[PDB]
Amino acid sequence: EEDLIQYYQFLAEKGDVQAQVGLGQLHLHGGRGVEQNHQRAFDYFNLAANAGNSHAMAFLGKMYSEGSDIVPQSNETALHYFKKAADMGNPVGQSGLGMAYLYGRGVQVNYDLALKYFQKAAEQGWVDGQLQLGSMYYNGIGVKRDYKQALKYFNLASQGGHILAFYNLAQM
Amino acid sequence: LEEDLIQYYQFLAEKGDVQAQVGLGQLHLHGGRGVEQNHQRAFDYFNLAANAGNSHAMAFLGKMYSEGSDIVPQSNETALHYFKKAADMGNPVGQSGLGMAYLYGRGVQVNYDLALKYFQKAAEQGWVDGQLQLGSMYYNGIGVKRDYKQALKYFNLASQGGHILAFYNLAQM
């Protein structure tokens, strides 16, 4: 079991992008056998992102949107990354741009754009995108109020994004 | 007021809403948010929705038929009927159903080629179980020659909850 973690660090060192992102995330939270390190997380994420991995880009965007002493907070490079991610089209990126257009974070407030981004994320099962979309329907922000739309997306979010999510969690 | 929503769903299912029939069916199948475990109402909702063309309803039926109960008397041949209807429509649960069927010759002749290809189709869709089956086959060289790295890829996917982003979703379920 320890060998599997070291094997992964080995494959990541040799350019396995999947391994870089996976490990990046485990250091970001502390994991299977992995001790938590934001340093190692940011470094892995830069590796995979420079290789073009959309998930890595989005993780960076997050770390810049919510800055620590290792990654100092900056909404401008968080935007840079959410936009690279979203172009490809990663739901986390789509959500990020969504928030930016909803609240004018580094961009002019634009409710249609927000709406379309949250919808794109929401379709891909991204619970947050669904929550955001639900709020906009509930509060009639991007659109005219539809409590039932809100109900649909809130329901999806509560199921974990998809009716089958339970079963994936049932084995995790 | 959650009860009012459960009743609102009962209302929508009763008026032909396929999603609501399937959703409530699932809640009755396991026992859930405000809902009592009831295999009978589960089976009725699943039949209602399957007749309407819903792949999830079909797959659920396939499941309670491969795995018999007192309500649903076991028949892996109709379990196969439904897994095949679901799989025809891209449903990962169905695809996985055929996969098991071919892996272990349940109501069908053993065929590792088919098991492997059905598990691939389901795994592609983030379905943790299909990823596990596929991983097992590569790891123990069942359908093909042992491919430790393939095995590893799918085990990793499974361990992440089917997708690297899955943890973030499943944390809010």
How far is A102 from A105, CA to CA, in rounded Å? Answer: 8
Burial B127-154 (b: 16+ CB within 10 A, else e): bbbbbbbbbbbbbeeebeeeeeeebbbb
Query: Chain A window 59-98: which residues touch B at a Cβ cutoff of 8 Å?
Result: 91-92
Is the Cβ pair A164, B129 closer than 8 Å? no
Considering only CB atoms, B169 lies closest to which of A32, A155, A165, namely: A165
How far is B46 from B29, CA to CA, in rounded Å? Answer: 10
A89 prior amide bond cis, ω within 30 = yes
Is the Cβ pair B126, A168 closer than 8 Å? yes
Distances (CA, A) of A134 to A89, A130, B65: 21, 6, 36
* A127: contact with B, CB 8 A cutoff: yes
How far is A24 from A41, CA to CA, in rounded Å? Answer: 4
- In three state form, how does the secondary structure of chain A look? CHHHHHHHHHHHHCCCHHHHHHHHHHHHHCCCCCCCCHHHHHHHHHHHHHCCCHHHHHHHHHHHHCCCCCCCCCHHHHHHHHHHHHCCCCHHHHHHHHHHHHHCCCCCCCHHHHHHHHHHHHHCCCHHHHHHHHHHHHCCCCCCCCHHHHHHHHHHHHCCCCCCHHHHHCCC
How far is A55 from B4, CA to CA, in rounded Å? Answer: 39
Listing DSSP states for B56-110 in one string gives HHHHHHHHHHHS--SSS---HHHHHHHHHHHHTTT-HHHHHHHHHHHHHTSSS--
How far is B23 from B29, CA to CA, in rounded Å? Answer: 10
How far is A170 from B30, CA to CA, in rounded Å? Answer: 12
Cα dihedral A39→A29→B172→A78 (10° resolution): 0
Cβ-based contacts of B46 with chain A (< 8 Å): none
Nearest Cα neighbor of A165 from B135, B36, B169 is B169
* A160: contact with B, CB 8 A cutoff: yes
* A166: contact with B, CB 8 A cutoff: yes
Q: How was this one solved?
A: X-ray
Cβ-based contacts of B93 with chain A (< 8 Å): 164, 167
Is the Cβ pair A171, B159 closer than 8 Å? no
* B11: contact with A, CB 8 A cutoff: no
Is the Cβ pair B169, A161 closer than 8 Å? yes
* B12: contact with A, CB 8 A cutoff: no
* Residue B109 backbone phi and psi in degrees, to 5: -70, 135
How far is A81 from A106, CA to CA, in rounded Å? Answer: 13
Q: What residue in B sits closest to A128 (Cα-Cα)?
A: B169
Length of chain A: 172
Nearest Cα neighbor of B135 from B148, B118, B122 is B148
